[PDB]
Amino acid sequence: DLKASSLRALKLMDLTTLNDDDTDEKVIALCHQAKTPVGNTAAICIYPRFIPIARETLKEQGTPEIRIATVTNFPHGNDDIDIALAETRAAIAWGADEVDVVFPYRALMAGNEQVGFDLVKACKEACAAANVLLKVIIETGELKDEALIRKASEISIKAGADFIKTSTGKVAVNATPESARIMMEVIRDMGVEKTVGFKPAGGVRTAEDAQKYLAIADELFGADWADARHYRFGASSLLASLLKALGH
């Protein structure tokens, strides 16, 4: 049970460091940690200014295909499209393979559904031109309400999200199995399972946690569905828990 789930989950990790005071040394160490005795993580996720040093570290350890994700409009999810789009354009220029943008969830909570569509769509158009995948963080722990989680997910998908993602990791409540079920049901109901991935992020701590999230995916979409284009774990400490479950 835990061995099989843990080796799947490890391969799906966006191994992340997003601190206010990160350093090159910490990002280098993270890149080294992404190359494990049982597999490489799918990606690393770091702030944009670290993309060049991460790319060279990944090449120099012989893992050039570990993707580099970053974040924009982050963590706030403010509703200023010009800023979100400028930050997304800058992340592309820094060399990102993927951008995880924060949806304007407080504007949605205040009744504005259109700004979330326009913000995601603008960011998607910049990313798509550069062959960069766009994940959209809806911040389920602050939306709280099931109807709002569904609505933010639907808007994001309609606007072109390549993934929908639970959380920034910067608020009090991040991924939960409840939130994951709701978001994956939207992917199912909208018929976009082929084109939209899911990423639970923040507070995914243990191999046991990861096994729960994969069980939801397998139930909704079949055991074949999850893969790097369709599923990621936004996590850090989880990696050591997965390796421990695997005997490392």
PDB file of C-alpha atoms in Angstrom, residues 38-241:
ATOM      1  CA  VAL A  38      14.247   5.772  -6.437  1.00  0.00           C
ATOM      2  CA  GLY A  39      13.403   8.493  -8.921  1.00  0.00           C
ATOM      3  CA  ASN A  40      13.419  12.174  -9.758  1.00  0.00           C
ATOM      4  CA  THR A  41      10.638  14.491  -8.656  1.00  0.00           C
ATOM      5  CA  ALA A  42       8.535  15.939 -11.463  1.00  0.00           C
ATOM      6  CA  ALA A  43       9.654  19.471 -10.720  1.00  0.00           C
ATOM      7  CA  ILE A  44      11.107  21.945  -8.323  1.00  0.00           C
ATOM      8  CA  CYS A  45       9.266  25.124  -7.416  1.00  0.00           C
ATOM      9  CA  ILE A  46      11.211  28.231  -6.430  1.00  0.00           C
ATOM     10  CA  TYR A  47      11.003  32.005  -6.761  1.00  0.00           C
ATOM     11  CA  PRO A  48      11.841  33.334 -10.256  1.00  0.00           C
ATOM     12  CA  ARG A  49      15.227  34.817  -9.402  1.00  0.00           C
ATOM     13  CA  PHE A  50      16.524  31.310  -8.585  1.00  0.00           C
ATOM     14  CA  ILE A  51      15.576  29.743 -11.926  1.00  0.00           C
ATOM     15  CA  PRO A  52      19.003  30.242 -13.588  1.00  0.00           C
ATOM     16  CA  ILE A  53      21.033  28.687 -10.760  1.00  0.00           C
ATOM     17  CA  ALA A  54      18.522  25.852 -10.411  1.00  0.00           C
ATOM     18  CA  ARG A  55      18.655  25.105 -14.137  1.00  0.00           C
ATOM     19  CA  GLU A  56      22.424  24.862 -14.099  1.00  0.00           C
ATOM     20  CA  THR A  57      22.397  22.687 -10.970  1.00  0.00           C
ATOM     21  CA  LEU A  58      19.856  20.310 -12.513  1.00  0.00           C
ATOM     22  CA  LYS A  59      21.910  20.048 -15.711  1.00  0.00           C
ATOM     23  CA  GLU A  60      25.159  19.504 -13.815  1.00  0.00           C
ATOM     24  CA  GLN A  61      23.716  16.563 -11.843  1.00  0.00           C
ATOM     25  CA  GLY A  62      22.361  14.953 -15.027  1.00  0.00           C
ATOM     26  CA  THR A  63      18.658  15.626 -14.390  1.00  0.00           C
ATOM     27  CA  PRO A  64      17.811  18.138 -17.134  1.00  0.00           C
ATOM     28  CA  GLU A  65      14.202  17.025 -17.381  1.00  0.00           C
ATOM     29  CA  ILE A  66      13.162  17.990 -13.844  1.00  0.00           C
ATOM     30  CA  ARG A  67      10.845  20.905 -14.557  1.00  0.00           C
ATOM     31  CA  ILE A  68      11.238  24.324 -12.941  1.00  0.00           C
ATOM     32  CA  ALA A  69       8.005  25.857 -11.674  1.00  0.00           C
ATOM     33  CA  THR A  70       7.609  29.240 -10.039  1.00  0.00           C
ATOM     34  CA  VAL A  71       4.835  31.435  -8.629  1.00  0.00           C
ATOM     35  CA  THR A  72       3.229  34.761  -9.606  1.00  0.00           C
ATOM     36  CA  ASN A  73       0.577  37.060  -8.189  1.00  0.00           C
ATOM     37  CA  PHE A  74       1.799  35.393  -5.019  1.00  0.00           C
ATOM     38  CA  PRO A  75       0.769  34.757  -2.336  1.00  0.00           C
ATOM     39  CA  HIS A  76      -1.908  37.449  -2.249  1.00  0.00           C
ATOM     40  CA  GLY A  77      -4.089  36.732  -5.283  1.00  0.00           C
ATOM     41  CA  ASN A  78      -4.647  40.423  -5.728  1.00  0.00           C
ATOM     42  CA  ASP A  79      -6.978  41.540  -8.491  1.00  0.00           C
ATOM     43  CA  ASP A  80      -4.550  43.796 -10.416  1.00  0.00           C
ATOM     44  CA  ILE A  81      -4.230  42.061 -13.782  1.00  0.00           C
ATOM     45  CA  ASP A  82      -1.380  44.319 -14.930  1.00  0.00           C
ATOM     46  CA  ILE A  83       0.752  43.233 -11.977  1.00  0.00           C
ATOM     47  CA  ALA A  84      -0.164  39.543 -12.265  1.00  0.00           C
ATOM     48  CA  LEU A  85       0.577  39.594 -15.995  1.00  0.00           C
ATOM     49  CA  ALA A  86       3.849  41.528 -15.557  1.00  0.00           C
ATOM     50  CA  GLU A  87       4.970  39.029 -12.929  1.00  0.00           C
ATOM     51  CA  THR A  88       4.010  36.102 -15.193  1.00  0.00           C
ATOM     52  CA  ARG A  89       5.908  37.676 -18.101  1.00  0.00           C
ATOM     53  CA  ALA A  90       8.925  38.159 -15.835  1.00  0.00           C
ATOM     54  CA  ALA A  91       8.776  34.524 -14.669  1.00  0.00           C
ATOM     55  CA  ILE A  92       8.798  33.445 -18.330  1.00  0.00           C
ATOM     56  CA  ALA A  93      11.827  35.677 -18.945  1.00  0.00           C
ATOM     57  CA  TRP A  94      13.639  34.185 -15.913  1.00  0.00           C
ATOM     58  CA  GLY A  95      13.222  30.817 -17.670  1.00  0.00           C
ATOM     59  CA  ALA A  96      10.305  29.087 -15.909  1.00  0.00           C
ATOM     60  CA  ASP A  97       8.863  25.918 -17.373  1.00  0.00           C
ATOM     61  CA  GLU A  98       5.654  26.371 -15.369  1.00  0.00           C
ATOM     62  CA  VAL A  99       3.965  29.250 -13.589  1.00  0.00           C
ATOM     63  CA  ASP A 100       1.624  28.769 -10.618  1.00  0.00           C
ATOM     64  CA  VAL A 101      -0.464  32.000 -10.474  1.00  0.00           C
ATOM     65  CA  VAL A 102      -2.764  32.925  -7.585  1.00  0.00           C
ATOM     66  CA  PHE A 103      -6.379  33.437  -8.596  1.00  0.00           C
ATOM     67  CA  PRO A 104      -8.040  36.671  -7.330  1.00  0.00           C
ATOM     68  CA  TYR A 105     -10.030  34.778  -4.737  1.00  0.00           C
ATOM     69  CA  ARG A 106     -10.943  37.763  -2.563  1.00  0.00           C
ATOM     70  CA  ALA A 107     -12.438  39.509  -5.584  1.00  0.00           C
ATOM     71  CA  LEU A 108     -14.499  36.390  -6.243  1.00  0.00           C
ATOM     72  CA  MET A 109     -15.607  36.352  -2.591  1.00  0.00           C
ATOM     73  CA  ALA A 110     -16.734  39.983  -3.054  1.00  0.00           C
ATOM     74  CA  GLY A 111     -18.839  38.941  -6.052  1.00  0.00           C
ATOM     75  CA  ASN A 112     -16.559  39.566  -9.023  1.00  0.00           C
ATOM     76  CA  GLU A 113     -16.308  36.426 -11.169  1.00  0.00           C
ATOM     77  CA  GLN A 114     -15.020  38.172 -14.265  1.00  0.00           C
ATOM     78  CA  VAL A 115     -11.673  39.431 -12.986  1.00  0.00           C
ATOM     79  CA  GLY A 116     -10.556  35.876 -12.222  1.00  0.00           C
ATOM     80  CA  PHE A 117     -11.365  34.818 -15.772  1.00  0.00           C
ATOM     81  CA  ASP A 118      -9.575  37.814 -17.290  1.00  0.00           C
ATOM     82  CA  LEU A 119      -6.513  37.462 -15.046  1.00  0.00           C
ATOM     83  CA  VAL A 120      -6.092  33.730 -15.698  1.00  0.00           C
ATOM     84  CA  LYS A 121      -6.750  34.132 -19.423  1.00  0.00           C
ATOM     85  CA  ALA A 122      -4.128  36.879 -19.795  1.00  0.00           C
ATOM     86  CA  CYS A 123      -1.536  34.857 -17.908  1.00  0.00           C
ATOM     87  CA  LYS A 124      -2.379  31.719 -19.908  1.00  0.00           C
ATOM     88  CA  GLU A 125      -1.892  33.547 -23.190  1.00  0.00           C
ATOM     89  CA  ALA A 126       1.593  34.679 -22.183  1.00  0.00           C
ATOM     90  CA  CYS A 127       2.532  31.227 -20.899  1.00  0.00           C
ATOM     91  CA  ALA A 128       1.110  29.355 -23.905  1.00  0.00           C
ATOM     92  CA  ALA A 129       3.115  31.469 -26.329  1.00  0.00           C
ATOM     93  CA  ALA A 130       6.259  30.371 -24.457  1.00  0.00           C
ATOM     94  CA  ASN A 131       5.229  26.712 -24.097  1.00  0.00           C
ATOM     95  CA  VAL A 132       4.971  27.251 -20.320  1.00  0.00           C
ATOM     96  CA  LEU A 133       2.262  25.434 -18.340  1.00  0.00           C
ATOM     97  CA  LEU A 134      -0.023  27.556 -16.128  1.00  0.00           C
ATOM     98  CA  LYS A 135      -1.280  26.255 -12.793  1.00  0.00           C
ATOM     99  CA  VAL A 136      -3.921  28.326 -10.955  1.00  0.00           C
ATOM    100  CA  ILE A 137      -3.972  28.462  -7.137  1.00  0.00           C
ATOM    101  CA  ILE A 138      -7.500  29.149  -5.865  1.00  0.00           C
ATOM    102  CA  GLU A 139      -6.654  29.235  -2.097  1.00  0.00           C
ATOM    103  CA  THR A 140      -9.306  26.806  -0.881  1.00  0.00           C
ATOM    104  CA  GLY A 141      -8.407  27.483   2.774  1.00  0.00           C
ATOM    105  CA  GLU A 142      -9.475  31.112   2.418  1.00  0.00           C
ATOM    106  CA  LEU A 143     -12.412  30.558   0.056  1.00  0.00           C
ATOM    107  CA  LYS A 144     -13.696  27.994   2.600  1.00  0.00           C
ATOM    108  CA  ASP A 145     -17.118  27.521   1.036  1.00  0.00           C
ATOM    109  CA  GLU A 146     -17.704  24.539  -1.279  1.00  0.00           C
ATOM    110  CA  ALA A 147     -19.652  26.630  -3.832  1.00  0.00           C
ATOM    111  CA  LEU A 148     -16.847  29.186  -4.034  1.00  0.00           C
ATOM    112  CA  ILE A 149     -14.192  26.457  -4.392  1.00  0.00           C
ATOM    113  CA  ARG A 150     -16.205  24.994  -7.254  1.00  0.00           C
ATOM    114  CA  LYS A 151     -16.740  28.415  -8.865  1.00  0.00           C
ATOM    115  CA  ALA A 152     -13.072  29.420  -8.683  1.00  0.00           C
ATOM    116  CA  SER A 153     -12.136  26.051 -10.165  1.00  0.00           C
ATOM    117  CA  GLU A 154     -14.673  26.462 -12.993  1.00  0.00           C
ATOM    118  CA  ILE A 155     -13.582  30.011 -13.826  1.00  0.00           C
ATOM    119  CA  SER A 156      -9.940  28.963 -13.857  1.00  0.00           C
ATOM    120  CA  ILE A 157     -10.639  26.020 -16.178  1.00  0.00           C
ATOM    121  CA  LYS A 158     -12.769  28.150 -18.508  1.00  0.00           C
ATOM    122  CA  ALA A 159      -9.954  30.704 -18.686  1.00  0.00           C
ATOM    123  CA  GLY A 160      -7.409  28.066 -19.712  1.00  0.00           C
ATOM    124  CA  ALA A 161      -5.734  26.741 -16.563  1.00  0.00           C
ATOM    125  CA  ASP A 162      -3.517  23.721 -17.274  1.00  0.00           C
ATOM    126  CA  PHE A 163      -3.772  22.720 -13.593  1.00  0.00           C
ATOM    127  CA  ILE A 164      -5.928  23.804 -10.689  1.00  0.00           C
ATOM    128  CA  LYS A 165      -4.078  23.938  -7.381  1.00  0.00           C
ATOM    129  CA  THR A 166      -5.470  24.118  -3.842  1.00  0.00           C
ATOM    130  CA  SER A 167      -3.279  26.547  -2.004  1.00  0.00           C
ATOM    131  CA  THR A 168      -0.225  28.756  -1.691  1.00  0.00           C
ATOM    132  CA  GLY A 169       1.124  27.118   1.492  1.00  0.00           C
ATOM    133  CA  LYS A 170       1.212  30.651   2.957  1.00  0.00           C
ATOM    134  CA  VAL A 171      -2.209  30.722   4.655  1.00  0.00           C
ATOM    135  CA  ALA A 172      -3.486  28.902   7.732  1.00  0.00           C
ATOM    136  CA  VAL A 173      -5.343  26.105   5.895  1.00  0.00           C
ATOM    137  CA  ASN A 174      -3.941  24.595   2.696  1.00  0.00           C
ATOM    138  CA  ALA A 175      -4.745  21.253   1.037  1.00  0.00           C
ATOM    139  CA  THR A 176      -7.285  18.890   2.596  1.00  0.00           C
ATOM    140  CA  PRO A 177      -8.823  15.726   1.172  1.00  0.00           C
ATOM    141  CA  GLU A 178     -12.237  17.454   1.224  1.00  0.00           C
ATOM    142  CA  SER A 179     -10.946  20.343  -0.875  1.00  0.00           C
ATOM    143  CA  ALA A 180      -9.180  17.957  -3.244  1.00  0.00           C
ATOM    144  CA  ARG A 181     -12.376  15.973  -3.780  1.00  0.00           C
ATOM    145  CA  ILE A 182     -14.336  19.129  -4.608  1.00  0.00           C
ATOM    146  CA  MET A 183     -11.761  20.400  -7.097  1.00  0.00           C
ATOM    147  CA  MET A 184     -11.290  17.054  -8.801  1.00  0.00           C
ATOM    148  CA  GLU A 185     -15.067  16.702  -9.110  1.00  0.00           C
ATOM    149  CA  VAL A 186     -15.044  19.980 -11.066  1.00  0.00           C
ATOM    150  CA  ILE A 187     -12.395  18.588 -13.424  1.00  0.00           C
ATOM    151  CA  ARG A 188     -14.650  15.524 -13.847  1.00  0.00           C
ATOM    152  CA  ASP A 189     -17.899  17.472 -14.280  1.00  0.00           C
ATOM    153  CA  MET A 190     -16.352  19.824 -16.822  1.00  0.00           C
ATOM    154  CA  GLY A 191     -14.979  16.876 -18.827  1.00  0.00           C
ATOM    155  CA  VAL A 192     -11.425  18.301 -18.782  1.00  0.00           C
ATOM    156  CA  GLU A 193      -9.599  15.404 -17.146  1.00  0.00           C
ATOM    157  CA  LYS A 194      -7.448  15.035 -20.289  1.00  0.00           C
ATOM    158  CA  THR A 195      -6.293  18.671 -20.260  1.00  0.00           C
ATOM    159  CA  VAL A 196      -6.408  19.908 -16.652  1.00  0.00           C
ATOM    160  CA  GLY A 197      -4.283  18.521 -13.853  1.00  0.00           C
ATOM    161  CA  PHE A 198      -4.759  18.753 -10.103  1.00  0.00           C
ATOM    162  CA  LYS A 199      -2.192  19.852  -7.497  1.00  0.00           C
ATOM    163  CA  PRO A 200      -2.867  19.635  -3.760  1.00  0.00           C
ATOM    164  CA  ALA A 201      -0.311  21.856  -2.044  1.00  0.00           C
ATOM    165  CA  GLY A 202       0.630  22.900   1.465  1.00  0.00           C
ATOM    166  CA  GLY A 203       0.251  20.719   4.535  1.00  0.00           C
ATOM    167  CA  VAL A 204       0.795  17.472   2.597  1.00  0.00           C
ATOM    168  CA  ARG A 205       3.176  16.077   5.160  1.00  0.00           C
ATOM    169  CA  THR A 206       3.333  12.283   5.132  1.00  0.00           C
ATOM    170  CA  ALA A 207       3.327   9.284   2.886  1.00  0.00           C
ATOM    171  CA  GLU A 208      -0.066   8.481   4.433  1.00  0.00           C
ATOM    172  CA  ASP A 209      -1.384  11.906   3.371  1.00  0.00           C
ATOM    173  CA  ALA A 210      -0.133  11.423  -0.179  1.00  0.00           C
ATOM    174  CA  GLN A 211      -1.773   7.991  -0.396  1.00  0.00           C
ATOM    175  CA  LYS A 212      -5.137   9.578   0.480  1.00  0.00           C
ATOM    176  CA  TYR A 213      -4.913  12.184  -2.298  1.00  0.00           C
ATOM    177  CA  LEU A 214      -3.931   9.606  -4.890  1.00  0.00           C
ATOM    178  CA  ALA A 215      -6.862   7.416  -3.823  1.00  0.00           C
ATOM    179  CA  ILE A 216      -9.290  10.233  -4.719  1.00  0.00           C
ATOM    180  CA  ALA A 217      -7.658  10.645  -8.144  1.00  0.00           C
ATOM    181  CA  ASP A 218      -7.772   6.929  -8.851  1.00  0.00           C
ATOM    182  CA  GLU A 219     -11.431   6.708  -7.796  1.00  0.00           C
ATOM    183  CA  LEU A 220     -12.573   9.628  -9.981  1.00  0.00           C
ATOM    184  CA  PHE A 221     -10.418   9.103 -13.081  1.00  0.00           C
ATOM    185  CA  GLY A 222      -8.982   5.586 -12.921  1.00  0.00           C
ATOM    186  CA  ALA A 223      -5.584   4.364 -11.773  1.00  0.00           C
ATOM    187  CA  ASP A 224      -4.009   5.316 -15.121  1.00  0.00           C
ATOM    188  CA  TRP A 225      -4.854   9.024 -14.896  1.00  0.00           C
ATOM    189  CA  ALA A 226      -2.303  10.510 -12.512  1.00  0.00           C
ATOM    190  CA  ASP A 227       1.015  11.369 -14.140  1.00  0.00           C
ATOM    191  CA  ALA A 228       3.214  14.452 -14.273  1.00  0.00           C
ATOM    192  CA  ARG A 229       0.934  16.274 -16.738  1.00  0.00           C
ATOM    193  CA  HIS A 230      -2.143  15.573 -14.593  1.00  0.00           C
ATOM    194  CA  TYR A 231      -1.070  15.502 -10.962  1.00  0.00           C
ATOM    195  CA  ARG A 232       1.499  17.146  -8.711  1.00  0.00           C
ATOM    196  CA  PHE A 233       2.135  17.393  -4.976  1.00  0.00           C
ATOM    197  CA  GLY A 234       3.199  20.860  -3.828  1.00  0.00           C
ATOM    198  CA  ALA A 235       5.357  19.827  -0.915  1.00  0.00           C
ATOM    199  CA  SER A 236       8.759  19.699   0.775  1.00  0.00           C
ATOM    200  CA  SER A 237       9.029  17.608   3.954  1.00  0.00           C
ATOM    201  CA  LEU A 238       6.859  15.005   2.242  1.00  0.00           C
ATOM    202  CA  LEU A 239       9.853  13.858   0.185  1.00  0.00           C
ATOM    203  CA  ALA A 240      11.711  12.529   3.243  1.00  0.00           C
ATOM    204  CA  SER A 241       8.510  10.788   4.403  1.00  0.00           C
TER     205      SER A 241
END
